[PDB]
Amino acid sequence: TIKEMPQPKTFGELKNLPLLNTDKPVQALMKIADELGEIFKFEAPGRVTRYLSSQRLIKEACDESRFDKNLSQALKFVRDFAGDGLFTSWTHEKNWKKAHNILLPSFSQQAMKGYHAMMVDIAVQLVQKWERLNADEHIEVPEDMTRLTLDTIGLCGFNYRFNSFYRDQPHPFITSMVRALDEAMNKLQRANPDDPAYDENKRQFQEDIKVMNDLVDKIIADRKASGEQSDDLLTHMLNGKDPETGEPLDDENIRYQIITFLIAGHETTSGLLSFALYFLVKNPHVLQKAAEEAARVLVDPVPSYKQVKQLKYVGMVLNEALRLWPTAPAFSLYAKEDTVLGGEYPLEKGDELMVLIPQLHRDKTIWGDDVEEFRPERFENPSAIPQHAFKPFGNGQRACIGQQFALHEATLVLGMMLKHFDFEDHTNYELDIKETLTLKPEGFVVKAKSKKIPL
Numbered sequence: 374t375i376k377e378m379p380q381p382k383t384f385g386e387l388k389n390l391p392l393l394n395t396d397k398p399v400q401a402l403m404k405i406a407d408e409l410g411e412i413f414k415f416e417a418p419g420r421v422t423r424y425l426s427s428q429r430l431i432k433e434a435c436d437e438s439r440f441d442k443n444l445s446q447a448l449k450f451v452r453d454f455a456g457d458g459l460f461t462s463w464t465h466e467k468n469w470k471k472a473h474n475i476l477l478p479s480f481s482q483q484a485m486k487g488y489h490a491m492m493v494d495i496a497v498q499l500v501q502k503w504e505r506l507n508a509d510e511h512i513e514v515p516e517d518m519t520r521l522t523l524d525t526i527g528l529c530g531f532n533y534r535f536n537s538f539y540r541d542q543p544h545p546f547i548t549s550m551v552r553a554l555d556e557a558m559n560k561l562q563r564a565n566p567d568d569p570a571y572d573e574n575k576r577q578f579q580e581d582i583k584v585m586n587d588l589v590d591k592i593i594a595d596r597k598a599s600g601e602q603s604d605d606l607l608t609h610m611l612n613g614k615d616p617e618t619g620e621p622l623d624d625e626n627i628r629y630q631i632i633t634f635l636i637a638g639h640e641t642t643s644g645l646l647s648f649a650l651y652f653l654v655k656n657p658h659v660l661q662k663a664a665e666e667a668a669r670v671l672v673d674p675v676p677s678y679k680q681v682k683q684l685k686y687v688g689m690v691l692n693e694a695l696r697l698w699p700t701a702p703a704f705s706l707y708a709k710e711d712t713v714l715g716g717e718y719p720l721e722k723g724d725e726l727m728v729l730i731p732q733l734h735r736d737k738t739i740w741g742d743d744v745e746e747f748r749p750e751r752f753e754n755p756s757a758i759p760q761h762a763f764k765p766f767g768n769g770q771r772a773c774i775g776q777q778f779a780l781h782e783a784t785l786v787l788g789m790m791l792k793h794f795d796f797e798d799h800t801n802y803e804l805d806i807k808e809t810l811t812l813k814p815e816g817f818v819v820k821a822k823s824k825k826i827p828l
């Protein structure tokens with residue numbers, strides 16, 4: 374069998390590093406994936422990674438007895454401000470298991486009924502903003518969806534109102550957060566700490582962290598001082614105890630959990646809503662089926678939890694957009710012990726594998742030949758889909774805890790947008806995928822004509 378592992382061109386002691394020295398790394402890796410195939414060795418000075426693009430190989434990588442979540446380099450950087458939150462912890466860290474056991478039931482589909490009203494609040498603010506645009510103004514899709522997701526996570530997370538729909542300049546926290554994330558991403562493509570970065574950046578970085586730590590800390594302190602019982606994630610963490618040690622979460626970890634909900638949930642969820650709208654506006658017939666379902670189900674001024682769950686086709690639209698462009702493009706895994714992958718490629722204990730989600734979703738072997746086409750119908754019968762072929766939310770006990778939250782919000786919002794407006798792609802937008810920790814359609818603009826249905 375073809376057992377030797379290919380590799381892209383190298384640049385001496387710099388190795389393949391220069392290969393991703395671009396503002397669109399994942400998309401570049403996808404090209405390399407097309408050329409080299411379902412697996413290639415990517416080497417850097419003191420780091421080797423193996424990228425997987427096949428369902429054949431990836432279903433083996435998802436075997437939890439052989440592979441576990443690895444903290445990629447980027448995640449290690451993000452750990453400087455996200456600490457030991459669910460997202461940047463090792464599976465073997467005690468605070469990971471603890472937070473995971475306590476928070477698991479609060480993120481179930483059943484628990485969404487408690488967060489529903491808060492999600493509806495921000496969703497109505499979005500509709501009303503659009504309702505009030507003068508007919509000649511347009512919509513900055515990614516920009517509004519991000520305001521929508523940040524405010525929703527803030528309300529549901531710690532009952533705080535960032536009030537993004539009342540300002541051009543975001544709340545200072547949000548600003549320090551995007552800035553810290555930026556720095557963490559730039560550190561990844563740093564030639565070395567002195568090309569680019571110097572004391573000025575690190576200083577700025579440590580500053581943003583204080584702005585974040587200060588706000589969350591204060592809020593935690595104020596709540597346990599007043600003893601308030603709201604329906605947000607913070608209440609659940611203050612009154613929660615792990616069924617295993619009987620221990621509760623510490624105030625520092627609770628802080629990291631909140632910061633983690635923000636950094637891990639806002640861009641991914643905003644990207645999702647933007648892409649779905651993009652494919653819908655580019656595919657008039659799909660938009661027509663969706664719009665019709667929305668008008669048929671959402672027969673009340675404000676959507677009920679029950680009604681959101683009936684938006685069957687809309688859900689299919691979201692899943693198809695998640696197939697084509699998973700907003701969180703990759704996750705890393707490490708070999709627990711030595712093994713051979715796919716019976717061909719030998720792996721040693723500790724070897725890092727990197728799942729290229731966008732490539733996995735284009736596996737002709739699993740999805741057929743029209744993999745590049747946006748066809749929601751392919752998710753009509755989800756049970757007909759092979760195991761580990763569709764992985765937009767990670768794998769196993771380390772999969773996105775916020776999967777239900779994201780999908781419920783995305784469905785609620787998409788449903789409401791399709792009920793109140795007709796969308797016009799007045800600029801004949803050409804997809805431009807901007808990359809940060811996540812993927813998003815940069816510069817996507819549309820124009821919305823209201824159907825004049827009251828809220």
Ligand code: HEM
Nearest residue numbers: 459460634637638641642701704766767771773774775779
């Ligand atoms: C549609 C949007 C979303 C996508 C595509 C997404 C994707 C993912 C992926 C791929 C991972 C695994 C990362 C890894 O294995 O290294 C993950 C983990 C996680 N996500 Fe999401 N996510 C989304 C929305 C959310 C939301 C709204 C929240 C926050 C409330 C959230 C919170 C988390 C957390 C905390 C983890 C870590 C779970 C653990 O390991 O214990 N995500 N997500």
